[PDB]
From Swiss-Prot, chains C, D:
Interacts with capsid protein VP0 and capsid protein VP1 to form heterotrimeric protomers. Five protomers subsequently associate to form pentamers which serve as building blocks for the capsid. It comes from Human parechovirus 1 (strain Harris). The N-terminus binds RNA. Coiled coil: none annotated. Forms an icosahedral capsid of pseudo T=3 symmetry together with capsid proteins VP0 and VP1. The capsid is 300 Angstroms in diameter, composed of 60 copies of each capsid protein and enclosing the viral positive strand RNA genome. Capsid proteins interact with host alpha-V/beta-3 integrin heterodimer to provide virion attachment target cell. This attachment induces virion internalization predominantly through clathrin-mediated endocytosis. Binds packaging signals present in the viral RNA. This is Capsid protein VP3. The chain holds residues 493 to 542 of 2180 of the full protein. It is found in: Virion; Host cytoplasm.
Amino acid sequence: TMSPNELGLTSAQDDGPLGQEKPNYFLNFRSMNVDIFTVSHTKVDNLFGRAWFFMEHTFTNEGQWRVPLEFPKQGHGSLSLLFAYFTGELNIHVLFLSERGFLRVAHTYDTSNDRVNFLSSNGVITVPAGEQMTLSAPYYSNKPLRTVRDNNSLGYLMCKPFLTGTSTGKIEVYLSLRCPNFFFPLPAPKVT
Amino acid sequence: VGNEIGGNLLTKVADDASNILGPNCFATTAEPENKNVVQATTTVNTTNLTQHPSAPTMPFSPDFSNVDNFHSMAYDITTGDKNPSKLVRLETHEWTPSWARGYQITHVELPKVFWDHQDKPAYGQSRYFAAVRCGFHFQVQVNVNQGTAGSALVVYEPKPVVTYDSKLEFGAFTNLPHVLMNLAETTQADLCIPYVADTNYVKTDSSDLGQLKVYVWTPLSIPTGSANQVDVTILGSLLQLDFQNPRVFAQDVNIYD
Amino acid sequence: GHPIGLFQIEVLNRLTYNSSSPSEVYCIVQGKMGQDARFFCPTGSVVTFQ
Amino acid sequence: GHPIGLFQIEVLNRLTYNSSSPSEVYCIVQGKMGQDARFFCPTGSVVTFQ
């Protein structure tokens, strides 16, 4: 039968270990699970499998653009802030807004600035002007885990455009991840 | 009977008058999460007694193996443990050619020499224990060019010998674990010495285990052109180590009577 | 959207005490989802965290 | 002969109390031999009992 513990009478100091799926009942109540869709939208793989805006850059010349990639404190991706460590594939969505040219894109977790001077070794997929690509950067991280908060939690992204004439433009960036491994959930964030 | 009996009566009475809809009340009685118990925890030479314990906690689906499966440190897991038994340089000295037979080249206080400086692998632990019981493995090294010749006596002298050293006849020291090592023939001597004393344990930071010495069997015959600076080095390893008596940091404690 | 409901904690029996015990105590209210909890559509953000 | 060792009892957490309880208590230290205790040679006496 039902114990008084499952009826509401408990002790907060007896909750450890963390993660106790204890059932709560009353005479007219029972945990009822109802699913409205064929799958879950709470699973890390599904939720995060959907991109979210990151930042935009306007380029008037080929100069290279390197930006630290970090988890959002803004979109649905904020749900990541509930975790401390991450590891796994990283989907980067880049849009090249230009009239005539090409955009070199590359990703590295390496903090050294110089390693990115010769962009070709790193990757540098090519998005023709007016096209958008989605490259999935692997976990080539020199650190087993990525503190999820760091201003560079995610590796740096490189964008250099091979323009042809006076043409200029702007590069919008969106980020998403493939199968994410989060660990050791930390306390919920505050609001600004 | 009572006060334990109530969940059943209420649960039952509710049960008896139940109609088509069912009972209109359920009652369950049991013991509180915070029961009258006592917990005891023991770590190395420690015991924590608590009479008001609480449910221990821990992270989600935790792994306490504590072993890095990637081996970011490619060392034997027991490296830190065995570290203090590691081979180390106990002494170095330059034999002077003029020295007569039977002269003492160099000596090392045993066993406190393994904690000779704070830079000794064993110095760390040796501090937190007053008693010691260990075995030794010495390797006295002496290098000399082929042109030169000579011989040194590497011998282990227990406290008994060290005490009455002058009363003993040199040339008979070959009765003790030694290595008459003829230069120009051997560059190193090996000596395996077990725990030797008249007491089960020796005070840490003491010379009671005796001391290893190096004498002049036959003085160095160094030709004219040949070099004249021969160095004698004493290396030591602990075949087996054992620190028992706990004590304050490096405080002289008397294990003896 | 719409509130979850009205939450009220009324006094039933005055907190009793004695010479060496407090005449008033502190209380904490926590909240969590049930074992049948579910979330469905991800939407935009209404606030910015830090 | 040589002492058995240094015996020290330090305070870890101040003895708490209330209006009707003592602010300090009495303590007693007893001593006995373990189940592996043994004595060996009988010797002369160093003191005289009564």
